[PDB]
Write a protein that binds this ligand. Structure first.
Ligand SMILES: [Mg+2]
Ligand SMILES: [Mg+2]
Ligand SMILES: [Mg+2]
Ligand SMILES: [Mg+2]
Ligand SMILES: [Mg+2]
Ligand SMILES: [Mg+2]
Ligand SMILES: [Mg+2]
Ligand SMILES: [Mg+2]
Ligand SMILES: [Mg+2]
Ligand SMILES: [Mg+2]
Ligand SMILES: [Mg+2]
Ligand SMILES: [Mg+2]
Ligand SMILES: [Mg+2]
Ligand SMILES: [Mg+2]
Ligand SMILES: [Mg+2]
Ligand SMILES: [Mg+2]
Ligand SMILES: [Mg+2]
Ligand SMILES: [Mg+2]
Ligand SMILES: [Mg+2]
Ligand SMILES: [Mg+2]
Ligand SMILES: [Mg+2]
Ligand SMILES: [Mg+2]
Ligand SMILES: [Mg+2]
Ligand SMILES: [Mg+2]
Ligand SMILES: [Mg+2]
Ligand SMILES: [Mg+2]
Ligand SMILES: [Mg+2]
Ligand SMILES: [Mg+2]
Ligand SMILES: [Mg+2]
Ligand SMILES: [Mg+2]
Ligand SMILES: [Mg+2]
Ligand SMILES: [Mg+2]
Ligand SMILES: [Mg+2]
Ligand SMILES: [Mg+2]
Ligand SMILES: [Mg+2]
Ligand SMILES: [Mg+2]
Ligand SMILES: [Mg+2]
Ligand SMILES: [Mg+2]
Ligand SMILES: [Mg+2]
Ligand SMILES: [Mg+2]
Ligand SMILES: [Mg+2]
Ligand SMILES: [Mg+2]
Ligand SMILES: [Mg+2]
Ligand SMILES: [Mg+2]
Ligand SMILES: [Mg+2]
Ligand SMILES: [Mg+2]
Ligand SMILES: [Mg+2]
Ligand SMILES: [Mg+2]
Ligand SMILES: [Mg+2]
Ligand SMILES: [Mg+2]
Ligand SMILES: [Mg+2]
Ligand SMILES: [Mg+2]
Ligand SMILES: [Mg+2]
Ligand SMILES: [Mg+2]
Ligand SMILES: [Mg+2]
Ligand SMILES: [Mg+2]
Ligand SMILES: [Mg+2]
Ligand SMILES: [Mg+2]
Ligand SMILES: [Mg+2]
Ligand SMILES: [Mg+2]
Ligand SMILES: [Mg+2]
Lengths: 124, 260, 155, 188
RNA sequence: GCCCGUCGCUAGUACCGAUUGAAUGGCUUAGUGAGGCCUCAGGAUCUGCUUAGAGAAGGGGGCAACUCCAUCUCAGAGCGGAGAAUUUGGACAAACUUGGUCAUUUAGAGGAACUAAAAGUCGUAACAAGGUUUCCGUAGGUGAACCUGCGGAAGGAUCAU
RNA sequence: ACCCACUCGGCACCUUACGAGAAAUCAAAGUCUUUGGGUUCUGGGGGGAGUAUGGUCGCAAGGCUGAAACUUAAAGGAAUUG
RNA sequence: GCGGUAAUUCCAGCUCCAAUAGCGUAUAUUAAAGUUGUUGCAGUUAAAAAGCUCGUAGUUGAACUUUGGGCCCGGUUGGCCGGUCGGAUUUCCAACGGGGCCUUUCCUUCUGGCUAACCUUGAGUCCUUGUGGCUCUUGGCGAACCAGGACUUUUACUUUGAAAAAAUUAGAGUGUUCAAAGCAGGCGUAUUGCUCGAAUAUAUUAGCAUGGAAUAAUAGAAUAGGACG
RNA sequence: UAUCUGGUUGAUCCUGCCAGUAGUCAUAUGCUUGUCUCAAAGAUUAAGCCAUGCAUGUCUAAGUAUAAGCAAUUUAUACAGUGAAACUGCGAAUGGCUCAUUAAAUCAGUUAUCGUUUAUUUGAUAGUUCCUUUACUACAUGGUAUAACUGUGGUAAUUCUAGAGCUAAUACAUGCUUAAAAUCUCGACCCUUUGGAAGAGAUGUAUUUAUUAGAUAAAAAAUCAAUGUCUUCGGACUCUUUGAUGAUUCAUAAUAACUUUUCGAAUCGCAUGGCCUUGUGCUGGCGAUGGUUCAUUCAAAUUUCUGCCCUAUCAACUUUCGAUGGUAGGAUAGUGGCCUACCAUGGUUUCAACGGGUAACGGGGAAUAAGGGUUCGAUUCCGGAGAGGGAGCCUGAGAAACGGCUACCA
RNA sequence: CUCUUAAGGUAGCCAAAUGCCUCGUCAUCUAAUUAGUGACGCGCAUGAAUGGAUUAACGAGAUUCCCACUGUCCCUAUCUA
């Protein structure tokens, strides 16, 4: 008799488990941005896939629809506020086109390295 | 279930109390009272969650037993006394007067009123009959039964009451074009000057509304509370005057205030 | 039903509390009582004219009509002062996005004010529990005879 | 004990219905008063909500009202002579509602002969005015007057004695008295 | 080359089956029937109201006559209440005995399938016109595949006088 | 009676393939991922097995309705080369 | 499918891969499965059309009954302009919708209450050479619904809306140090308060309320026992 | 977030299943295990069985204190502080747990009570109680009979209790009371008319029965039986009052009676003051517990419409010993075949009744991500059911209660 | 394969009222069964109108078990004519 403490999972897992091309491109990200898991890449692709999903569902509506405008601008403005979405391409047909490295780019892992201060993604 | 239930669980409490999910297991169960369970606000919720005048519920019991808080004139020592629409919450200390009146989103508001306005209340007559000894009476939405009222006073009218003596001072009838507070439904807390009433003999008269922004909506006649004239209420309305801006409108307002 | 000699029971039939003083020589011979059911349902003249004594009548009796008003076609008139109607309706199966014919039979009291026969569409109104199964009362007939007068002999 | 539920009792389809929920107190029944005549004895029963019901058993006098005459008297109850529900109530002289009983008729005689001054069957100053301002309204009835000789009048029970502890009713008159008369003699 | 059946060994599963076989669960006849409740009775004792006496008190107010309200104390008598054990008749009705029914299981001599199964023994049924073209239905017969009668099909070994 | 032209409705055959099919082939087996005219019936890997059991029909023989446990990685179709 | 003496499958050493505070296995279920097929299967020969025909229940079922033309009112986007110190409305223009009219045209219906709109007009006119414009009472709009009487062929579908618990889901705001969460919090004179919140959506069958009148049913006037007054 | 791959062949294209693959608010188990936050957890099988401890008790200025209890200060020689025991009052019908039964049941949405009970909270609500109505009824307040306690006891044994002796109330059981006025019945008389009268009783609320009022669809008249107000004595009666609902025999009121007569304060706490004819007269402040009726609130019980998994190797089912309906009654808080009596022959079904199964509590929901679906929900909220199995019942507003009783079975 | 016949016992059926061995073996019924029944069958010596197998109904027919019932018994007693 307590309100159930809600939870959720932050990662997804690829279906084909041994796709060698996919494994290659994953290590590159882990090696570039200094990750330790494939889950650290799985998480971002999971977050990115839901973001696209809202965008997909919104585009099928009619332009300047109440829900589409309200929730669409929020999604655009949020991605902008953290620095993942470019200032010019700011109308959600590009958030559909967003890729993984854009999210990886904003981690305190990378800004700490990009702005000197570590001279190495792993020193970061 | 062999008997009346005497415990209210959280997540089962009415949502318009705005009680957090965790931090406990139960909500205050409103006592038997003038207002229904699911449309009241117990004194503990008001003195602790609304006003922040107490941290624990144990302090609410300490404040109340000292006659500090008074309801509609009388003292009301009950911890979970069910207080509801149109009531008056007075503090002798703090010199503060409140009246329970709804938000625009469907919640009771912290509405501060004058010292003298807090001396009278409104009440919707829910039924009028001929009582024993030939004495006709009216009964208001908060249990009050007033004997010997005006004959023209019919059901669904509203009534201004003395709160100091029990009697009625003035009434308002239920005609087209009268200020209405919507109490119930997803239009709870709107205020819109009656347009038209759908009759429907057998059940659930509809009542069309039109606020001061040329917007229209309908609610069941039971959820309509007449509160005066076009632009001329009979109680001080809360800020925003129940106009229900859109989500896009409210986002603009809250973000139109952006400079420190 | 009730057909011919209303006084056909062990107990004397009478309307409750509708007193007729014998000392006062009257011409109507029985002070009779009736009410208007409501909702614009005409209280038929046969209920006012006739001299039946049904206490479950919605026009002369001590029941009230409130709640659901339903219609349906008459499918059995074999019970005394009560019938059974078949209300039909199509029920929607979403998975197939189509419908199926379903039906329910409703047992309903019928005042001898009305003269019903199988086939007639009838309007019924919900009242208190009348019997073990009857929860509706016949209140208006929408058919007449289902083209019975147009089924005569040779021309 | 007795249960008034419909949870037993095959459905309209005739189907057998399984037992769900042991018997409750609020669906209860109780036993009949089977109230007989004479030597008053009433027992109060404590009913739901604390309200009492007064179960009569052996009542002897009730309050019976002459309908067309505008009065009521408390008379002895002679016996039961006709019951539409069950003949055994008559054989046992059992008092229930809608029973046809016989009553004292002497309190109804005393009132009439004083009110009209006409002495059913076969001097003061104001009393002469009263009796004269009256009848022309005392042509009571053929088959209601011809019961006073025997000293007993037919009256129907309108109270529920097992519930209230009263055995009240009204003298039989007119069409209704004709009905039970026809029954009373054709089977005698 | 492929390949069919009887027959023989090992293991497994399911079946039929004397035992009028066994077990669990749900209903239920008939008989027996606890207890509480209702009800007819009952009176261990324990008092009410009413009727009168004997011995005293208190006064509506008198010179003798006159006279009310409360309360205490014993011979004795008229018309109601409480209420124990007990007890009549009831409805409700657990449960016991003996049966029936439904559902779910279930042992068994022995009987007879199938599989594992590939192979072993006897044959050559089938696939080439498979050496008697094959197959279907039906009927009878034979260690075994199978044979034969009658009527079909070509999925034939013939789209053709 | 025969000949010629037409037109309905027959049993078929010839050539094409726009089209269809795994193919053999098919004016339906076509007008289906550009997937909807109406409607009936059956099938869902191979054995086990049309067996067991119950029901029902029958004089019989048998008919109709008709499982499972277990076993198994194939069985099968059309075509191609040998 | 490997193993019967050089084993890319076993037992190990070495090295290597995958996921990683986690990883295997068993059982179930979902996806893959258009191998249950409404969307969406297959049935000549691969598994599958009853030997044949009748036939009730069931499902299904030809076409046709106010179309076409005319006028008016006012809405929401989008243009060419910006009047103004990002956003604004007129006139010009399209474009797509809604309401109401007259064309032989029930709108259920009479009896008053009411009138919002003009066939009105009573004067003229702020003012661009005037039908651009509305305040404005004395003959003359019904439907815009009150309430009282008198009655009504039946339905399916679709529209909108009321009635509607919270947690859950989708989703807004908010930097729990992040995040899962939470419903907080954010500002100051941080020495005697200021203040934003605690949204929105789905809620689908049925029932209720309302707009629609295509599609698909139903009922009507044939022994006239018809229809209006 | 719309993907397939391995395995039939000498090769080939199919059909087709097997295998792989990923997820699981999905259980287990193996190996391994450092930090933060978060936190399910004897459901599955056995609603099988249970040692022991605990989980229901509760006091205000304000019902009852002679503890032979403590405390003494402090106005207190009836009491007065604090307070064991005990009485009284209230609560124990909530909560918590489990998912056994249960398939038109439960349950969900949607209805109904003009078909009922409702402690409580809140708001209203009570001048009537007596008696043939001057030698009068306790109202300055009527009755005992009990616990605790004191003492005498029984039993191996318990939240066992017996005999004897005391004493309380907001326990129990009784029983007074208050204005005015009107309307009704009787009627002593007097006098004859057109008649009208001194004063005797009745009349709180509740209960039971009967009668009646509670109009309204728009307007007028003659007459009968009664009998109302005002006479300018042929006569007129002019103004005459009406509540709610779609709807009632509704609310409410009136009449004649009825009742082992419901209620109408014999209660408590703080203050103690006005006002004279000085009676310790007569008055009087605040709020506590109560109390009948109505309302309100917390509820409850029934209840309309529609919607459940598999099953025909279940096709007819239902009335034995109610199945479907009618009349009357009984019983219930109330509707109703709920039960009884009488009468009738009905009620359901291929649009699947009835029966069987469920390793079935229903729902909010959960898992799986093109869509359409598939599968699951014992379990944090809602509803229901239960307390070893049945049945019965006491108390009470509320229980067919089980941390209540009684009986049978285990 | 071999001897040999007119032919060399087929379908059935069985320790059967037919089996010596025999109180056959297995199961069942019982505390215990030369009994009963169901099975098995190289059956001394079953077997087809010398008719074989099956069989509802019927039987003062032979046999076995069960229920009810009982002085048959334990274990005897008593009365009448
Ligand atoms: Mg509370
Ligand atoms: Mg009948
Ligand atoms: Mg046996
Ligand atoms: Mg009885
Ligand atoms: Mg087999
Ligand atoms: Mg084989
Ligand atoms: Mg060969
Ligand atoms: Mg061969
Ligand atoms: Mg051959
Ligand atoms: Mg070709
Ligand atoms: Mg070696
Ligand atoms: Mg080697
Ligand atoms: Mg090696
Ligand atoms: Mg994994
Ligand atoms: Mg579709
Ligand atoms: Mg397929
Ligand atoms: Mg073939
Ligand atoms: Mg085939
Ligand atoms: Mg064919
Ligand atoms: Mg057929
Ligand atoms: Mg058509
Ligand atoms: Mg909707
Ligand atoms: Mg292979
Ligand atoms: Mg190969
Ligand atoms: Mg080769
Ligand atoms: Mg698989
Ligand atoms: Mg659990
Ligand atoms: Mg368990
Ligand atoms: Mg087990
Ligand atoms: Mg205690
Ligand atoms: Mg003391
Ligand atoms: Mg509970
Ligand atoms: Mg006593
Ligand atoms: Mg009225
Ligand atoms: Mg004083
Ligand atoms: Mg059939
Ligand atoms: Mg009946
Ligand atoms: Mg019958
Ligand atoms: Mg079916
Ligand atoms: Mg279960
Ligand atoms: Mg389920
Ligand atoms: Mg599937
Ligand atoms: Mg559940
Ligand atoms: Mg379970
Ligand atoms: Mg219970
Ligand atoms: Mg247990
Ligand atoms: Mg119990
Ligand atoms: Mg317990
Ligand atoms: Mg309990
Ligand atoms: Mg032979
Ligand atoms: Mg043989
Ligand atoms: Mg033998
Ligand atoms: Mg023998
Ligand atoms: Mg023997
Ligand atoms: Mg033997
Ligand atoms: Mg034998
Ligand atoms: Mg031998
Ligand atoms: Mg022989
Ligand atoms: Mg025999
Ligand atoms: Mg014979
Ligand atoms: Mg024998």
């Amino acid at each position: 008799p307590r309100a159930p403490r809600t939870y959720s999972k932050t990662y997804s897992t690829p279906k084909r488990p041994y796709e060698s091309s996919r494994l290659d491109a994953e290590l590159k990200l882990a090696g570039e941005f200094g990750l330790k898991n494939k889950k650290e890449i799985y998480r971002i692709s999971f977050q990115l896939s839901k973001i696209r999903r809202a965008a997909r569902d919104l585009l099928t509506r009619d332009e300047k629809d109440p829900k589409r405008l309200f929730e669409g601008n929020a999604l655009i403005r949020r991605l902008v506020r953290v620095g993942v979405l470019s200032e010019d391409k700011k109308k959600l047909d590009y958030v559909l086109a967003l890729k993984v490295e854009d999210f990886l780019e904003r981690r305190l892992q990378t800004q700490v390295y990009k702005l000197g201060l570590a001279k190495s993604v792993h020193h970061a | 279930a062999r008997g009346p239930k005497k415990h209210l669980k959280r997540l089962a409490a009415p949502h318009h109390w705005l009680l957090d999910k965790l931090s406990g297991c139960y909500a205050p169960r409103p006592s038997a009272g003038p207002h229904k369970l699911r449309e009241s606000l117990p004194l503990i919720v008001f003195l602790r969650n609304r006003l922040k005048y107490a941290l624990n519920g144990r302090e609410v019991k300490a404040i109340l037993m000292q006659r500090h808080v008074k309801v509609d004139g009388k003292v009301r020592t009950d911890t979970t006394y069910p207080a509801g629409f149109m009531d008056v919450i007075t503090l002798d200390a703090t010199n503060e007067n409140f009246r329970l009146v709804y938000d625009v989103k469907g919640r009771f508001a912290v509405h501060r009123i004058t010292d003298e306005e807090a001396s009278y209340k409104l009440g919707k007559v829910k039924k009028v009959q001929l009582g024993k000894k030939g004495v006709p009476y009216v009964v208001t939405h908060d249990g009050r039964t007033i004997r010997y009222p005006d004959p023209n006073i019919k059901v669904n009218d509203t009534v201004k009451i003395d709160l100091a003596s029990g009697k009625i001072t003035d009434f308002i009838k239920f005609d087209a074009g009268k200020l209405v507070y919507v109490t119930g439904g997803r239009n709870l807390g709107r205020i819109g000057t009656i347009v038209h009433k759908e009759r429907h003999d057998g059940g659930f008269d509809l009542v069309h509304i039109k606020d001061s922004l040329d917007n229209t909506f309908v609610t069941r006649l039971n959820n309509v509370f007449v509160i005066g004239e076009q632009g001329k209420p009979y109680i001080s309305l809360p800020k925003g005057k129940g106009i229900k801006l859109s989500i896009a409108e409210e986002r603009d307002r809250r973000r139109a205030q952006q400079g420190l | 039903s009730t057909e011919l000699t209303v006084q056909s029971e062990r107990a004397f039939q009478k309307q409750p509390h509708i007193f007729n003083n014998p000392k006062v020589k009257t011409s109507k011979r029985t002070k009779r009582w009736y009410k208007n059911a409501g909702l614009g349902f005409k209280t038929p003249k046969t209920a006012i004219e006739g001299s039946y004594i049904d206490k479950k009548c919605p026009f002369t009796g001590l029941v009230s009509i409130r709640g659901k008003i339903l219609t349906g076609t008459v499918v059995s008139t074999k019970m005394h002062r009560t019938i059974v109607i078949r209300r039909a309706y199509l029920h929607y199966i979403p998975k197939y996005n189509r419908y199926e014919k379903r039906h329910k039979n409703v047992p309903v009291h019928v005042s001898p004010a009305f003269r019903v026969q199988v086939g007639d569409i009838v309007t019924v109104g919900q009242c208190r529990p009348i019997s073990k199964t009857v929860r509706f009362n016949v209140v208006k007939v929408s058919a007449a005879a289902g083209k019975a007068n147009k089924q005569f002999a040779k021309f | 004990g007795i249960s008034r539920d419909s949870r037993h009792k095959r459905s309209a389809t005739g189907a057998k219905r399984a037992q769900f929920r042991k018997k409750r107190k609020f669906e209860l029944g109780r036993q009949p008063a089977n109230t007989k005549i004479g030597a008053k004895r009433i027992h109060s029963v404590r009913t739901r909500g604390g309200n009492k019901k007064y179960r009569a058993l052996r009542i002897e006098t009730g309050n019976f009202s002459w309908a067309s005459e505008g009065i009521s008297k408390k008379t002895r109850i002679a016996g039961v002579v006709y019951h539409p529900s069950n003949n055994e109530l008559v054989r046992t002289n059992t008092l229930t509602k809608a029973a046809i009983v016989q009553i004292d008729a002497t309190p109804f005689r005393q009132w009439f002969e004083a009110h009209y001054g006409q002495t059913l069957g076969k001097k003061s100053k104001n009393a002469e005015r009263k009796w004269a301002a009256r009848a022309a309204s005392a042509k009571i009835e053929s088959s209601v007057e011809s019961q006073f000789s025997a000293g007993r009048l037919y009256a129907c029970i309108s109270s529920r004695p097992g519930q209230s502890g009263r055995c009240d009713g009204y003298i039989l008159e007119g069409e209704e008295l004709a009905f039970y008369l026809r029954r009373l003699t054709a089977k005698k």
